[PDB]
Design a protein around this nucleic acid. Sequence first.
DNA 1: ACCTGGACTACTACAACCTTCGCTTTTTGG
DNA 2: TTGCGAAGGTTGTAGTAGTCCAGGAAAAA
Lengths: 216, 99, 318, 312, 283, 269
Amino acid sequence: MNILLVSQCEKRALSETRRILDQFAERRGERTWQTPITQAGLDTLRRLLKKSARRNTAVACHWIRGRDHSELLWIVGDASRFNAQGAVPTNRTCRDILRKEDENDWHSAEDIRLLTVMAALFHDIGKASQAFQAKLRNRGKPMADAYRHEWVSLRLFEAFVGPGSSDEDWLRRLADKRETGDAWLSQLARDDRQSAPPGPFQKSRLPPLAQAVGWL
Amino acid sequence: MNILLVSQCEKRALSETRRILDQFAERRGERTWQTPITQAGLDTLRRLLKKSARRNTAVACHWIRGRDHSELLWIVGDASRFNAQGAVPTNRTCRDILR
Amino acid sequence: SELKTILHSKRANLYYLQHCRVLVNGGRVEYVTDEGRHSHYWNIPIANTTSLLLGTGTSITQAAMRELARAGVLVGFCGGGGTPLFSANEVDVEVSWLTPQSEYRPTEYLQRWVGFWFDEEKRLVAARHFQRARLERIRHSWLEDRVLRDAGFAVDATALAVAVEDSARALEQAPNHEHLLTEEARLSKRLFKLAAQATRYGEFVRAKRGSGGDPANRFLDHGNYLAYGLAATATWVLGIPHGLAVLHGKTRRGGLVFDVADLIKDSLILPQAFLSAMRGDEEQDFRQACLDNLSRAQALDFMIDTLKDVAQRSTVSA
Amino acid sequence: LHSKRANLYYLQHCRVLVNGGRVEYVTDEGRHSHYWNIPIANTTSLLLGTGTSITQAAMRELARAGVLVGFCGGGGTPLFSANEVDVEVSWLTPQSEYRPTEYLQRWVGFWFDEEKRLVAARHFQRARLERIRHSWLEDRVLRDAGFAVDATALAVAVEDSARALEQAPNHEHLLTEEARLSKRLFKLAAQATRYGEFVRAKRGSGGDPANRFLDHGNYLAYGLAATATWVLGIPHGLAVLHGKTRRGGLVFDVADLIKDSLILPQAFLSAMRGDEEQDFRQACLDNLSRAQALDFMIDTLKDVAQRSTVSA
Amino acid sequence: TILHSKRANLYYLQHCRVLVNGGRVEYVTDEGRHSHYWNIPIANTTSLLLGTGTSITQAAMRELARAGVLVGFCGEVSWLTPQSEYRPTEYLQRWVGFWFDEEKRLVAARHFQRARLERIRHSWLRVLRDDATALAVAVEDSARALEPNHEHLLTEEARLSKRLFKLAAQATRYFVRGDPANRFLDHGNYLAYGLAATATWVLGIPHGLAVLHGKTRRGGLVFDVADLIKDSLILPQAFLSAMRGDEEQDFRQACLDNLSRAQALDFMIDTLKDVAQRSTVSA
Amino acid sequence: ARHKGFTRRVEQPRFRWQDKAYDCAMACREQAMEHGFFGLNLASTGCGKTLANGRILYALADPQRGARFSIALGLRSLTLQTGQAYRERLGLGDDDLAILVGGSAARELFEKQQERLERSGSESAQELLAENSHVHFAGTLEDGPLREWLGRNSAGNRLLQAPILACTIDHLMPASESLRGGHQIAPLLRLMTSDLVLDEVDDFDIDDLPALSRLVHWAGLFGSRVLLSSATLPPALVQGLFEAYRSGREIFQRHRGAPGRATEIRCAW
DNA sequence: ACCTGGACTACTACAACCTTCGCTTTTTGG
DNA sequence: TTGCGAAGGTTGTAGTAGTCCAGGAAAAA
């Protein structure tokens, strides 16, 4: 079998490995050897190199198994000077070039941001009711409000969106800044009436995203 | 066929040969490349190396013809670095020793 | 002329990268990894490479892409670890290819191919030819490669002969596409059974959509993508568009890659995946063994030869 | 936006990456670069130029949305690599966001009929001889440039070529007429520029500045035509005028539409002023952009197919 | 550690000093302004040949003998055998028991000639490609001649060598034993003598005792053992190489390759052991 | 980070199994970072499980960046001496381990002030934590990324800053069991940003185990890594808890990490 | 007037880190 | 809060060979 041995040692380790290896192979390069050797020779070479190795030793042995094929047998000493295939890096540096802190992997950050921001802009809208304002200005004995302000906000939002409509409808309507007018408050199904209207969360009342915003 | 290429280049020639050879093979060492290749690609390699060579360039190519046998194909640049078989001197000295 | 001297069918290297950045450094195309307190530059022999698959956490720059294209090397992004790039509902996208456009390819094969793709019956004949070639190659690989036998791949010849003969009988009698697809599925299941038996694996069931957890399924799912790369480069080299699928197009986008990949996905992938799982190896070892095996079997040459033959016979029958 | 019809944008000096599920561009000019107004939908295509990089996650998101991607060269030409467009037929109906094309069917529907190919070649030649007139006569900017075009001789040559083109029975006669018109236009421009006797050396062997300028303009125009065919979806091999054997025929056929009308004046002007390569390249790109060539190439290519199907 | 057959190197040096440098054995050759050090892989070598204009230092001989390698000086050839190693004895005892009796010593001398003839026949029948009837006739005639006294055996061997030389010259189409063929034959003879000395030392038999050339020159056993491979391969190799118009170094590398490809050392050692065993059997 | 006490080997032969578990932690670290973790600890009493838990959890965390985790006891009230004993056994200075003394508050006590405060409509201004609870910590407190919203020195910011926390399970349960107000903000942020260790879980009463299951599910739903610890864990409890953790982990992987990867928790005993 | 090892002493080749700066490429058989 | 790769200059280190001085060895079965 013919093999190729390459050294990447440094400092005194280099002289030692040069001494040990030069007994078996002719020098084809400042750090490369190559020669036809038998199995026993290879085992004894591995043993000898293992015995006297240091911290700065890194020697790799490749076998030219046959046609268009060659394999890495073993690495003696430090294994961080080669990759799995036995190649070596071409250059090195300390300055980070991957700069992998800019990009994160929160795959739903934007959806959360949009849902929250839309929910924030409407959440406390119910505080415009006259009863709430009177309570704010009232200094005397307090009376608990007949309805929570969040429920009023939900009813106002439901009235605005318009029942049974697909998402794009109300989205487009809201986005159009020119459109203004209080003509959509006639659909405010008040819950004080004798007949209790259907709950806003039923299937025919709101589209999906509308319910997602309404829950928040 | 699989080949073994060893670069003895010097000074500026080193960067050029490293640039050319890196297109064709992986690096197994500071000055060693080794990969399978076809005859046409090898001829292109040699021609490209010859074209832009300089005074210091020194490159050698060995062929693993078969089992337990290998041959030297060519050298580009100065052949003083390598001997007839392709090996390289281990040391040099200006001081006469032979006498 | 200079970079493209080596034919696509004689180059040696195929690459699959992860957690790296591809860029040009000092006139060479290299990819940089991270090692904590230092970064390393590794070189890529573009003149001896066919394809390039980029997985998770990778990026590439315009200068690198310009260098790659000049040498006629395909590049494609894929979901890491055998899983598809993007999946949702019935949508699937395994790879997003970036084929070169600065090169000009031969005009004979495209003209012969497009001269029948708009005829149903000729497409059926082409599909039948594809399947016949597949069965022949399967028999060759499983009963004529002594390397697999030495590695420990033993199969009862009689059962294989029975299965292949039954499949050939059923296939050639297929009246329409659906029968062909169903018969191909039947043959696939039978081959799974036989392969599992051969290496004493035990009871095996093939998952779908990369949901498998046992080593066999993961190894097969990863080994699929190498075939995709080889098929893509084989289709490009002849100048045939990826979209003109003949068999699998009904379910995928850019199906011809999948069609031409099937010729090899069972001759050398299944045995090697099973052998590796039996050995308890890991992803890197299986990938290396499979790539060596493909290179030794000269798969790309076979794919190109089959495509040429199918086009020629399609023309001749007319 | 190179072309209004194609909806094709060009990006430079930018890193494309994803932060929290959204594709983001980082470039000088911060959060004011107009790259934030690029509709990401089925009807967009991105071309990345000088100083640019793209992450794998970004292209996952783009593929999810259905946006094609391509890497061009400095300024928008030439094209190095890009995605590929699939066909649209009754069968072959996968579920994906990418919008397919239909012009390959119509193109292949006549490329096998020799006479229809003859008609198409006639249309291409007519388009070229039409555009030569506009470029060489109407351009007030070109008139102020300095090279002086004599109306009489150019009109005589254009009319003679038009007569010859209308009466070409076979392809070879059309090629001969094309060569005659090209030589005559070369001579007219040479006389106008005072450059002296000039020729089109083979292999690009010409050492004179005119030769280098002509080769460079040719390279740029071929790149632009490659972009055109890719956008539309036709293959390069399916030549119309050239021989069926010559690879890349369609690219040169489409490229010829603008070459003799845009490149030719610029090369001689640069040679007269003796400018460097970079300035010449910039001038060619500026003239191509102003003339809105790519739009014209796309429009003509669609028009041929429309006429072929209408006459069917 | 490596069997002498497995070791795959044989050197023939010239105009060089052999010295130890930094614990390694290397030989130095002048070049002009600077001098060069080339290393010798002792653990992968079988023998070493020193030509004209070379010298050695005792510190190098120490290492060479320690590793087991063999050394010798040429311009017939004086060999230094490492005495610091202990070799098997039984083979030597059998060989001396055979060699003590002149009558027994007479037997088997043509046995080696027969083995060499068989090797020639088997080797001639595809490298030399890159008449069968005439070759068979010559082999049969030689065998008939070989199968009364040692002098007749020597004359028969000389006739066989002459016939083989004539046949080789005919195949080449270029013989007389100034031409490059003669010098190439001499160099090949030197190399084969080296291989024979190496094999004999490996076995452990004494070199001085000889078979058929004992009266001819000192250390006749080495020459006798060499003859087997010399006739088998040295002749055609030298003829072809000289015909090619190749320098001495090229011929020598080719001959080393051919000997290596043929596993000649195993051939010679096995044949020597077989001859010894048969001779003991006759006793 | 770089805590020598968790890295130092132990010479006493009775404390070698700790080294074995610590080694297994490195052996399993890589895949746990990507797929999850669900650890068990069945060492019998008297074996000093606290140091084992500290070392094992430290080993999992990436050495380059450091480690974070919290220890919860199944005790109604946590006396200070217990926290200091934990410090001693772990050998951590007062600048690296916060202690949450006391017990949980009553639900109805906050009601009356809320009704009184409802006069003004500022119901969002209620303190995150109860008034009795105090965080015994004296480390860095100036460079809080969330300092703006949580308060400069409120209990919340101190709780969030401390790399290691010791508390009772009743102080984390408001993450999922809270029905009114904003009592679930600080513990929820703690759950997202750190890891979890449960100690003497089977000490819980039978009818409180649903709540513990819900907490474990949410802990697995936000990217933490759980590690129970006791010596009397009946199989049914462990099976139920594993199923809950896996159910939670499956949802999380949709919204984090590389899409498409399978769901293979990395169990250990 | 012998021959190596070791310690000590110059004294160059390599390699990376820091600043600017232009942004192409022959482009031809198509 | 801000691209990408090349060329020129500066800074630091490992690695090579010359000089001179001192000691002269290998431990089975």
